[PDB]
Structures are given as C-alpha cells and as structure tokens.
UniProtKB/Swiss-Prot annotation, chain C:
SMART domains: CarD_TRCF
Annotated gene: carD
UniProt function note: Controls rRNA transcription by binding to the RNA polymerase (RNAP). Required for replication and persistence during infection of mice.
Protein name, as recorded: RNA polymerase-binding transcription factor CarD
Species this protein is from: Mycobacterium tuberculosis (strain CDC 1551 / Oshkosh)
Record flagged with keyword Protease: no
InterPro entries to which the protein is assigned, alphabetical: CarD-like/TRCF_RID (IPR003711), CarD-like/TRCF_RID_sf (IPR036101), CarD-like_C (IPR042215), CarD-like_regulator (IPR052531), CarD_C (IPR048792)
C-alpha cells in the first residue's frame, strides 16, 4: 500500500538552477506499507519516490 | 512481478518499489513532449500569453 | 516473553527495538501486536505475539552464543561443493535461515575465501550483508558498540 505524499524543500534555488543547468525540483517521500495476509505484519517505510 | 519471485519473510518496500520507471516518465514528459513547450519570452505579453 | 525496550533480534533484519505492545484490533479481535523497528532499513514492523515465534523473532543471544559461533568461526575443515552455483545457493539458504551459527559459518567461510582468492561482486555483497547483520547481532549481544564489535570480529577472524 501507499499513503501520505510529502515533499522536502527544493534542493537549490531558482537562479542557481537556471545558471548551473539543474532542473528545479524537490523530492517525493511516500509512506509505503507492505502487509502479509497469512502471518500478519505491516512493513512501513518512507520511500524516496 | 517480484511480489512472487522474492522470498517471503525477507522483503520490504525498499526491496519492492522501483522508482526508475517513475522518474523516467516524468523526465520524458517535461522533456520531449509537444505540450512541454519551450517558454516563449521575447516580451512579458508573450510570456503571459 | 516480550517487554518494552528489549533489544530483540529478528530475521533477516538483525536486532531491533520494540517500541510498544500495540492493541490494534482486527475483526473485533484485539491482537497484541508489537511495533518493532530496526536502524538500517528505517522500517517499523508490527507482529502478533502469538505467532511471533512462528515468524521467528528471537531474544538477544547470550554468552554460550558468542564462543559457540566463535568456535564455529574458529572451526577448521570446512569445505564446499566445487561448482560455485551450489555453494552460492546453499549458503544463500544458510543466510536465509538467519540462525546465528549458520551466519557465522557463512561469514567465516567467505572470509577464508576472499582472504585467499578475491571473489566476486555478488559474493562480496553476500559477505557484506551477512557481516552487517552479524555485527549488529553481536554488538547488541555483548552490547559493545558497532565499531568496537567490528574490531573484535576482525580480531577473531585472524585467530
């Protein structure tokens, strides 16, 4: 399963990205969740998307 | 696919999720698509328009 | 059997800290889950205490344990199948067992190999994962500080 999209801040400002040819972006963090039915667990993380 | 071939009681969403086809789709949208157009700014009016 | 704050060991992820005994019900049945997190993968696992031993969570290993595997780590005579594919699948299953004796066998065999030959990328990763989980296990077994446990494990390999 997936839940809760969440950003960080941007990694570099506008003018610095435009100068150094970086794409002005920001990371996606998604709380994933793996569940086994037969034994019964949850496997929750924060996956860099 | 790898929900089956991976062995149970060993795996986690860090080992399941592949973010490489996700990031590739965004990069091939913003690059090389006929709606991701090049910003036509020879004056503020065309920049707005 | 399980209390809060216990540095309990869990396959394949090494030792872990229990955080709470969760009463998260399912189908009107308040199972006694236990939120349990490791440091490496940054993941939190909830397991019912009934089948906790069926999934195989297990207490931190005492002293008989240390020399037991040491003795396994200081065990001579160990040889393997000649084709390395059988070797790889066999000790892969040995690491998949997660038993401390078998993990110690795997790391000392692979240490005797790469000390001798210089092996492989896959076999190097095979050593690295097993070394990491075994070092975390002994570093919370004797409770002696991951880097210091690395140093004493490098001490016992040369024998």
């Amino acid at each position: 399963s997936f839940s809760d999209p969440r950003f960080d801040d941007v990694k570099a400002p506008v003018d610095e990205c435009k100068d150094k040819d970086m794409t002005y972006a920001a990371p996606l963090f998604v709380t994933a969740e793996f569940i086994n039915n037969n034994t019964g667990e949850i496997k929750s993380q924060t996956v860099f998307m | 696919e790898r929900m089956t071939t991976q062995d149970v009681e060993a795996i986690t969403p860090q080992t399941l999720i592949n973010i490489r086809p996700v990031v590739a789709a965004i990069k091939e949208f913003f690059g090389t698509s006929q709606l991701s157009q090049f910003m036509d700014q020879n004056n503020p009016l065309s920049g707005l328009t | 059997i399980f209390k809060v704050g216990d540095t309990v060991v869990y396959p394949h992820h090494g030792a872990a800290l229990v955080e709470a005994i969760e009463t998260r019900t399912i189908k009107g049945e308040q199972k006694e889950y236990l939120v349990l997190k490791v440091a490496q993968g940054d993941l939190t696992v909830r397991v019912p205490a009934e089948n906790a031993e069926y999934v195989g969570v297990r207490d931190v290993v005492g002293q008989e344990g240390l020399d037991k595997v040491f003795q396994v780590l200081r065990a001579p005579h160990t040889e393997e199948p000649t084709n390395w594919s059988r070797r790889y699948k066999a000790n892969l299953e040995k690491l998949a067992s997660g038993d401390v004796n078998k993990v110690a066998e795997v790391v000392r065999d692979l240490w005797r190999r790469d000390q001798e030959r210089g092996l492989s990328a896959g076999e190097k990763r095979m050593l690295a994962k097993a070394r990491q989980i075994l070092v975390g296990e002994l570093a919370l077994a004797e409770s002696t500080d991951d880097a210091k446990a690395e140093t004493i494990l490098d001490e016992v390999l040369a024998a």
